[PDB]
Design an enzyme around this catalytic site. Structure first.
Site, PDB file in Angstrom:
ATOM      1  N   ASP A  30       0.794  -1.235   0.000  1.00  0.00           N
ATOM      2  CA  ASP A  30       0.000   0.000   0.000  1.00  0.00           C
ATOM      3  C   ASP A  30       0.828   1.288   0.000  1.00  0.00           C
ATOM      4  O   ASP A  30       1.263   1.768   1.059  1.00  0.00           O
ATOM      5  CB  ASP A  30      -0.968  -0.015   1.193  1.00  0.00           C
ATOM      6  CG  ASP A  30      -2.074   1.000   1.057  1.00  0.00           C
ATOM      7  OD1 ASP A  30      -3.122   0.819   1.715  1.00  0.00           O
ATOM      8  OD2 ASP A  30      -1.911   1.972   0.291  1.00  0.00           O
ATOM      9  N   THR A  31       1.000   1.864  -1.190  1.00  0.00           N
ATOM     10  CA  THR A  31       1.789   3.080  -1.335  1.00  0.00           C
ATOM     11  C   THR A  31       1.150   4.286  -0.641  1.00  0.00           C
ATOM     12  O   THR A  31       1.816   5.294  -0.413  1.00  0.00           O
ATOM     13  CB  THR A  31       2.017   3.431  -2.812  1.00  0.00           C
ATOM     14  OG1 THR A  31       0.751   3.620  -3.455  1.00  0.00           O
ATOM     15  CG2 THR A  31       2.777   2.312  -3.525  1.00  0.00           C
ATOM     16  N   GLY A  32      -0.146   4.208  -0.348  1.00  0.00           N
ATOM     17  CA  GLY A  32      -0.826   5.327   0.278  1.00  0.00           C
ATOM     18  C   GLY A  32      -0.581   5.415   1.776  1.00  0.00           C
ATOM     19  O   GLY A  32      -0.849   6.448   2.399  1.00  0.00           O
TER      20      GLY A  32
HETATM   21  C1  8BG Z   1      -7.519   6.769   2.795  1.00  0.00           C
HETATM   22  C2  8BG Z   1      -5.997   6.880   2.641  1.00  0.00           C
HETATM   23  C3  8BG Z   1      -5.620   8.355   2.531  1.00  0.00           C
HETATM   24  C4  8BG Z   1      -5.286   6.211   3.827  1.00  0.00           C
HETATM   25  N1  8BG Z   1      -5.580   4.744   3.992  1.00  0.00           N
HETATM   26  C5  8BG Z   1      -4.779   3.864   3.067  1.00  0.00           C
HETATM   27  C6  8BG Z   1      -5.595   3.294   1.892  1.00  0.00           C
HETATM   28  O1  8BG Z   1      -4.748   2.661   0.946  1.00  0.00           O
HETATM   29  C7  8BG Z   1      -6.754   2.337   2.293  1.00  0.00           C
HETATM   30  C8  8BG Z   1      -6.344   0.936   2.774  1.00  0.00           C
HETATM   31  C9  8BG Z   1      -7.562   0.100   3.095  1.00  0.00           C
HETATM   32  C10 8BG Z   1      -7.984  -0.911   2.208  1.00  0.00           C
HETATM   33  C11 8BG Z   1      -9.118  -1.675   2.505  1.00  0.00           C
HETATM   34  C12 8BG Z   1      -9.827  -1.437   3.679  1.00  0.00           C
HETATM   35  C13 8BG Z   1      -9.413  -0.432   4.565  1.00  0.00           C
HETATM   36  C14 8BG Z   1      -8.281   0.337   4.275  1.00  0.00           C
HETATM   37  N2  8BG Z   1      -7.680   2.203   1.161  1.00  0.00           N
HETATM   38  C15 8BG Z   1      -8.936   2.743   1.138  1.00  0.00           C
HETATM   39  O2  8BG Z   1      -9.473   3.388   2.042  1.00  0.00           O
HETATM   40  O3  8BG Z   1      -9.429   2.540  -0.111  1.00  0.00           O
HETATM   41  C16 8BG Z   1     -10.814   2.821  -0.285  1.00  0.00           C
HETATM   42  C17 8BG Z   1     -11.008   3.369  -1.683  1.00  0.00           C
HETATM   43  O4  8BG Z   1     -11.042   2.212  -2.521  1.00  0.00           O
HETATM   44  C18 8BG Z   1     -11.650   1.151  -1.766  1.00  0.00           C
HETATM   45  O5  8BG Z   1     -10.881  -0.053  -1.875  1.00  0.00           O
HETATM   46  C19 8BG Z   1     -10.242  -0.329  -0.624  1.00  0.00           C
HETATM   47  C20 8BG Z   1     -11.122   0.342   0.414  1.00  0.00           C
HETATM   48  C21 8BG Z   1     -11.669   1.570  -0.306  1.00  0.00           C
HETATM   49  C22 8BG Z   1      -3.340   4.234   2.746  1.00  0.00           C
HETATM   50  C23 8BG Z   1      -3.601   3.066   3.617  1.00  0.00           C
HETATM   51  S1  8BG Z   1      -5.895   4.131   5.593  1.00  0.00           S
HETATM   52  O6  8BG Z   1      -7.088   4.841   5.994  1.00  0.00           O
HETATM   53  O7  8BG Z   1      -5.892   2.678   5.560  1.00  0.00           O
HETATM   54  C24 8BG Z   1      -4.592   4.628   6.684  1.00  0.00           C
HETATM   55  C25 8BG Z   1      -4.652   5.921   7.202  1.00  0.00           C
HETATM   56  C26 8BG Z   1      -3.648   6.359   8.056  1.00  0.00           C
HETATM   57  C27 8BG Z   1      -2.591   5.503   8.404  1.00  0.00           C
HETATM   58  N3  8BG Z   1      -1.603   5.971   9.251  1.00  0.00           N
HETATM   59  C28 8BG Z   1      -2.545   4.200   7.885  1.00  0.00           C
HETATM   60  C29 8BG Z   1      -3.554   3.756   7.023  1.00  0.00           C
END
Ligand code: 8BG
Lengths: 99, 99
Positions: A25-27
């Protein structure tokens, strides 16, 4: 190797004697795993994204095996829906985005 | 080009003629943008993030440029910490993970 993005980039990791499936997860700044036991001191942390925040336990200096590599770094543990490998470990194994 | 992961992969996108900053997010299935105006009709989508499930607005066949590469596809609009470019558009611009 090269990993396409047509599907979720899932890999098998080994951590704390356990095998887990996790998302490259690059995000993510941080690596976040579902509830499990880890050795050492920890401190609480709040992390937030889509849907809001969850409370996690921060462990430092944790050894992980991923993609044929061994890396060390911080691992957050808590009620995440999916196991996430964040940039803090992705860098250590030489993972990059290319286009 | 190659983007390393020591810093957040924040890039410039262009949508509706306006430049924005967005995070290249391999852990996102979908592209989710901060509140903005988009043309045409929308429909709801339920997505699940780290904090839980939420409904967002789905716009299809939207023109969006990412790192100078033109894409046309689905963008969701809803409460997110930052604009995220998910796999649906990462695939369109030929982005891969490599190690
Ligand atoms: C929203 C981003 C800006 C940050 N998030 C990500 C993101 O990649 C998430 C991973 C994820 C996948 C499936 C289920 C729950 C989470 N994808 C996500 O929210 O994707 C959404 C949009 O497409 C859908 O497909 C996956 C869930 C939905 C970078 C990690 S986070 O909230 O997980 C996170 C926030 C802060 C810290 N410090 C660590 C992690």
């Amino acid at each position: 190797p090269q990993i396409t993005l047509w599907q979720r980039p899932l890999v098998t990791i080994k951590i704390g004697g356990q095998l887990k499936e996790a998302l490259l997860d690059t995000g993510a700044d941080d690596t976040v795993l579902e509830e499990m036991s880890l050795p050492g001191r920890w401190k609480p942390k709040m992390i937030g994204g889509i849907g809001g925040f969850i409370k996690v336990r921060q462990y430092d200096q944790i050894l992980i095996e991923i993609c044929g590599h061994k890396a060390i770094g911080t691992v957050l543990v808590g009620p995440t829906p999916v196991n996430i490998i964040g940039r803090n470990l992705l860098t250590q194994i030489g993972m990059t985005l290319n286009f």
